[PDB]
Structure formats: structure tokens, C-alpha cells
Design a protein around this ligand. Structure first.
Ligand SMILES: [Zn+2]
Ligand SMILES: [Zn+2]
Ligand SMILES: [Zn+2]
Lengths: 126, 129
């Protein structure tokens, strides 16, 4: 299976590790992990176009959209600020034109989204 | 992708930004930028297999060398008296597509010249254009 991973980092307490797995090229991508340091409640969760972190999350560009392909909806943080992520998505991919490897995963201040709290470049994983 | 970019960071003071450009598919890749916080001298400069920063550079995996010079071996960079390494390389082995694609993998700068010792800084190679 194709696998990817992303370490989310930002200016404040928000941080997380998100994993991706896709068993076949025309199949769904499993996305799972956790994000900490969030306000309790809903937060926008998107793939943005560029894997450019030269200005932190500011340089990631817009939502990836070759719904937007990059729109993975919202994640929910508990009372301790921890969001569990467990998503299966059939629009994103780890190959082809909807490929998100080398792009940026971003978690937002608000639900969908306000400021970009944390982000990371999506990389090939073992 | 015709351009990629990498922000190098580590546990210490080594930091940098490296650009990659490949205007023609399967063509030479231009690699350029600057790295600072280095000891004066030669430093190994490699693409490693995994774009996995979960444990900093320790999770970057081995030197990139698909069993279909390592593919990921971009040689050594030279830091000056101020600890700054200016990079301007052309490489025809790495690529931004295909079997030797380095998008989503990790760029690493080492403690020593290549035996290269610790990984001082690294970053995931991302799509820039
Ligand atoms: Zn967004
Ligand atoms: Zn969108
Ligand atoms: Zn190396």
C-alpha cells in the first residue's frame, strides 16, 4: 500500500501527526492520527496546494483543487484540546492528479475557516 | 510539479531553504539556496527515503536509493567562516517525477563530509509550483 505522513506544527501549542494509507490507486485514502493544542470543538482540516513552509502555513497557498479536493471537512477536539482524526476519503489520492504527496495539510482556527493554526508537508512514509 | 522547496530545521542551529527546479520532464534538476548554522567545512547533502519528520531527522530513513552513487547523493556542501553554505547544483539523477522522484522525501544536511555522521537538519521536500 502507498503510505504518507504529516507532522503538523505552528506558532502556538497546536501539533499533531497524521497518517495516510491507500491500498489501491482508485481506492479510498485512510487518514488517521491526532492533533493537540486545539480549542474544544470543530476545526477546518484541509489540504492546501503547495508544500511550501517557507512562511509557515502562510505560504501553503489555497485549498488544493486541481467540493474542493483538499476539503477533508472538520475535526473535533475534546475538552483537553485533543482531536482524534479518523477519516476515509475517496476524493484525495496518493497518486494521479488528486495526489496530495508534497502538499500541505492545514488545521484551522474555525469550522468550515479563519487562521491557519498548524501545518506540515505531506511526505512518503514507511 | 516543476518546482519544489524544502525548509531545513533540526534540534540545533542549522537551518536553510533549498529550491529545486525541473522545467523539463526527466531533465536536469537545478538545486539552490542557503544553509546556515554549520561548522566551517564540508557537509554531506542527501535526499533520504521518507518524508517522515515524526521523530525529527531520525525518522527520515536511509539514503534514498531505490533498487528500481546513491540516487539521493547530492554530494557535499561547503560552509564558510560564518557557517553559511551557499548551494547551487545541477543534478541529472534526481527528478521531480518518476522513479527517482524526490517530492515528499526528506532533504538532509549532515555533520560531516561523506561516515557523514549525524543529521543536523532536514525537511520534507514539497511542491512549490
Ligand atoms: Zn484551508
Ligand atoms: Zn475548500
Ligand atoms: Zn545521508
Amino acid at each position: 500500500a502507498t503510505k504518507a505522513v504529516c507532522v503538523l506544527k505552528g506558532d502556538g501549542p497546536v501539533q499533531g501527526i497524521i497518517n495516510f494509507e491507500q491500498k489501491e490507486s482508485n481506492g479510498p485514502v485512510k487518514v488517521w492520527g491526532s492533533i493537540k493544542g486545539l480549542t474544544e470543538g470543530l476545526h477546518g482540516f484541509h489540504v492546501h496546494e503547495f508544500g511550501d513552509n517557507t512562511a509557515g502555513c502562510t505560504s501553503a497557498g489555497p485549498h488544493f483543487n486541481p467540493r474542493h479536493v483538499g476539503d477533508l471537512g472538520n475535526v473535533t477536539a475534546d475538552k483537553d484540546g485533543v482531536a482524534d482524526v479518523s477519516i476515509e476519503d475517496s476524493v484525495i489520492s496518493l497518486s494521479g492528479d488528486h495526489c496530495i504527496i508534497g502538499r500541505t495539510l492545514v488545521v484551522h482556527e474555525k469550522a468550515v475557516a479563519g487562521s491557519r493554526l498548524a501545518c506540515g508537508v505531506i511526505g512518503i512514509a514507511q
